[PDB]
Design a protein around this ligand. Structure first.
Ligand code: HEM
Ligand code: HEM
Ligand SMILES: CNCC#Cc1cc(F)c(F)c(CCc2cc(C)cc(N)n2)c1
Ligand SMILES: CNCC#Cc1cc(F)c(F)c(CCc2cc(C)cc(N)n2)c1
Ligand SMILES: C[C@H](O)[C@H](O)[C@H]1CNc2nc(N)[nH]c(=O)c2N1
Ligand SMILES: C[C@H](O)[C@H](O)[C@H]1CNc2nc(N)[nH]c(=O)c2N1
Ligand SMILES: [Zn+2]
Lengths: 410, 414
């Protein structure tokens, strides 16, 4: 059928036809919705229909469906799956598939940018040293002295599952986390385990609060190897506040480049298990989640202290007050350092505009309300009032198992 | 469907196991290929063949609840219901079953963060009501009991079930207490813009509007499928709270107030296939319902700008977060004014913490707890509340509260 989505603030109705093209499952059924579940539950035979479908939509997108180039490309892929059990994408197809995996990422509020993506082909890579070189060039290009630029680097596809390329870091730039003897945690508590894997592999930790983790890089299914990203490539921002001059004394910083490195890029049945991709931050990612999650840096108490807020009852809303000031500081600091950052009002604003674009030109836009709505001030942003349909289009970004639970060590 | 489904809390790592979903009875709107979990409203009476298994399902569940499943009272009740449907094509609930069904409709309400209270619900049986004047008496008694001078008590008043669909009891009000909205010729709106359509109906029905910013609407009550009739709620029964701020002495100069009793009156209560089309129920407020939605939605009272101006905030850039700063202070004022006047209210931190504890107990004792994350997470400060990090499963258990068409869209005027 045709499905309608209403904005309850604007009363704008959009009509979704694009959902007719999905085939992956969402995890819901007619009787149970799993919309808030974070991770809901090849061969030559499985591969050609998937390859065919992707080649078909590629040649439909450059408006040459059924052309001679389309016909030969289909046969070319057929012979290649036959005689090698896989196939290799053309450069144009690799670029098209990467942009469309971003376009289809239902959890990303930043997709108005989807077609401006720099795609680095790293499929000639064979070693962890080559991976490091490719990743350093990615970081340097995408950082661009603070004028951040979207980028993805694509390493060789999975073959037999035994020669996977993997970036073991979940993101290219993170801070370490250390278990203290007295039971508390120094640095980033979310990274205590990965940090401990780096230490076990020979990393000499400085045991500070903001230690950039080394890259841990696995090429062709071999043991991963450690590398230190050159510090001049890692842009960082000291967090200060435009009105509270004591805020700089908290000693807070963050890195400028958000770069997801633990996901799987699927294009036409091919699986790119190592595809680090990066954009720029929405302020709440740092200011709400990284700093104020109870399992993360957990600074609300300290800020509420220096703000002298009444902290004896929840109904004083002291946490909400300190939350807003922290997120003012983050935005103010990146902006003062001319480092690209978007606030959640602008980003959600852009996303509503992007949805309108997509419904008009494409017939819909898959979107995960649970992830799109920012983690603070939800209903004063326009996406809170926007109904969204969620569905899985391919090419896509997918989760995959953490490598340390799979890898057969040597 | 699989027998066990697991939900994780990503902040605490607690994993819970759900088996109650195997009892889900109706459709969510999702499919295997599309999820409709953010659609507000996804998707003539019941025949004898439809009614038999729906009643048995409910009667079994009631007798299971009192540890008399399979007993002689259970089999005799099954038989009496079945004979009553056969001869009259409907049946009547016992007082005990009515109370049980209403409490469990709340218990099953996936969008309600307040369900830790579900078993403490005063049920007013109003199935003997025949006229709109009597509906008015019943609703007044409900409002006075539930308000309780500010020490609010949850309550539901249940009016006669649907018969042929042409004799429905309906409260035309969507909530028992709401403020009027008036469209001006110049396009601006006075009062509550959400209620302009309903206010116009009341004016047409004969209501004389005071044309103020906080005018309590009259009740528009439909008995037995007749044309609805207007009644004014006695103002001494409508408890209200002037909104002042503990620090900002100028906040009281804004002239804001709100009513104490949230009372939903447009929903349908389904118990064992019976349809109670008029079942007003009330609890107490979570502060953000007033402080965030009623006051700061753009299409509502929309005070963020004016509070920001008095706060002397940089309003040129969105990235100063002036909107977020003002929103917090408005919600501080709402909670502070309700507490100072000793009117029951709950902040979004206490409510979500309570709901996590409730959800955990339901998983342990009942095998699950259906919950709609999109509705459970508060509209401000989402991730600093525990429900944000809590995976939830959503499904439709019966007894339930359901939406129904607005009655001015279906009523056949006499
Ligand atoms: C350019 C500016 C961008 C902005 C402002 C932005 C914003 C966001 C935010 C706030 C999230 C939620 C992140 C979280 O809570 O962990 C997200 C998720 C995501 N983004 Fe974007 N993003 C951008 C660029 C990109 C790019 C370049 C890609 C890929 C080519 C991408 C793909 C994704 C994916 C797959 C997710 C979901 C990740 C997951 O499921 O864990 N985004 N984005
Ligand atoms: C006693 C304290 C209660 C609290 C703190 C509470 C809290 C809430 C809140 C904050 C919402 C979201 C409302 C919205 O955003 O429009 C809600 C929804 C709901 N509540 Fe509760 N509630 C309470 C009592 C009750 C009672 C007594 C019932 C029924 C007997 C009930 C049934 C529901 C239902 C059905 C909804 C969904 C309404 C809809 O879909 O429009 N609640 N509740
Ligand atoms: C359940 N969440 C797990 C997580 C996470 C996580 C941790 C990080 F360090 C990090 F940089 C990110 C970035 C997410 C992201 C990606 C992109 C491309 C842009 C953006 N603006 N944001 C995500
Ligand atoms: C866009 N949704 C339509 C709506 C609405 C709406 C309007 C109101 F005036 C109002 F009081 C409520 C109360 C909801 C509610 C109910 C109960 C029992 C307790 C509580 N704490 N809250 C809901
Ligand atoms: C589109 C979206 O579902 C809609 O705005 C919802 C979001 N969550 C909500 N949550 C509550 N409690 N109440 C609401 O009215 C809404 N509105
Ligand atoms: C349980 C729930 O699915 C989980 O907490 C989600 C909620 N929404 C989110 N939204 C974003 N953007 N990022 C997240 O990590 C999460 N976490
Ligand atoms: Zn769903």
């Amino acid at each position: 059928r045709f499905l309608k989505v209403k904005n309850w603030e604007t009363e704008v109705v959009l009509t979704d036809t694009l959902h007719l093209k999905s085939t992956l499952e969402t995890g819901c059924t007619e009787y149970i919705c799993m919309g808030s579940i974070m991770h809901p539950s090849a061969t030559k035979d499985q591969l050609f229909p998937l390859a065919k479908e992707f080649i078909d939509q590629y040649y439909s997108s450059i408006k040459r469906f059924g052309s001679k180039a389309h016909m030969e490309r289909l046969e070319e892929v057929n012979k290649e799956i036959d005689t090698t059990s896989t196939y290799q994408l053309k450069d144009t197809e690799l670029i098209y598939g990467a942009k469309h995996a971003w376009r289809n990422a239902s959890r990303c509020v930043g997709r108005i940018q989807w077609s401006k993506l720099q795609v680095f082909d790293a499929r000639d890579c064979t070693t962890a040293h080559g991976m490091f070189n490719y990743i350093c060039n990615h970081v340097k290009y995408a950082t661009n002295k603070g004028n951040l630029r979207s980028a993805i680097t694509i390493f060789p596809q999975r073959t037999d599952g035994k020669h996977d390329f993997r970036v073991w870091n979940s993101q290219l730039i993170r801070y370490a986390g250390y278990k203290q003897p007295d039971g508390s945690t120094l640095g980033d508590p979310a990274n205590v385990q990965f940090t401990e894997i780096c230490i076990q592999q020979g990393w000499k930790p400085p045991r500070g609060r903001f230690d950039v983790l080394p890259l841990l890089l696995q090429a062709n299914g071999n043991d991963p190897e450690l590398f230190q990203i050159p510090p001049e490539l890692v842009l960082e921002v000291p967090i200060r506040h435009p009105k509270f001059e004591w805020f700089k004394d908290l000693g807070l910083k963050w890195y400028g480049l958000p770069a997801v490195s633990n996901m799987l890029l699927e294009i036409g049945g091919l699986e790119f298990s190592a595809c680090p991709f990066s954009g720029w931050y929405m302020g709440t990612e740092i200011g709400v989640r990284d700093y104020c999650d109870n399992s993360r840096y957990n600074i609300l108490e300290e800020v509420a202290k220096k703000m002298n807020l009444d902290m004896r009852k929840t109904s004083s809303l002291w946490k909400d007050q300190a939350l807003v000031e922290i997120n003012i500081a983050v935005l103010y600091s990146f902006q003062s350092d001319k480092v690209t950052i978007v606030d959640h009002h602008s980003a959600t604003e852009s996303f509503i505009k992007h949805m309108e674009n997509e419904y008009r030109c494409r017939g819909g836009c898959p979107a995960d309300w649970v992830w799109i709505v920012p983690p603070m001030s939800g209903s004063i942003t326009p996406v809170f009032h926007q109904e969204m349909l969620n569905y899985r289009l391919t090419p896509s970004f997918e989760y995959q198992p953490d490598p340390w639970n799979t890898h057969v060590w040597k």
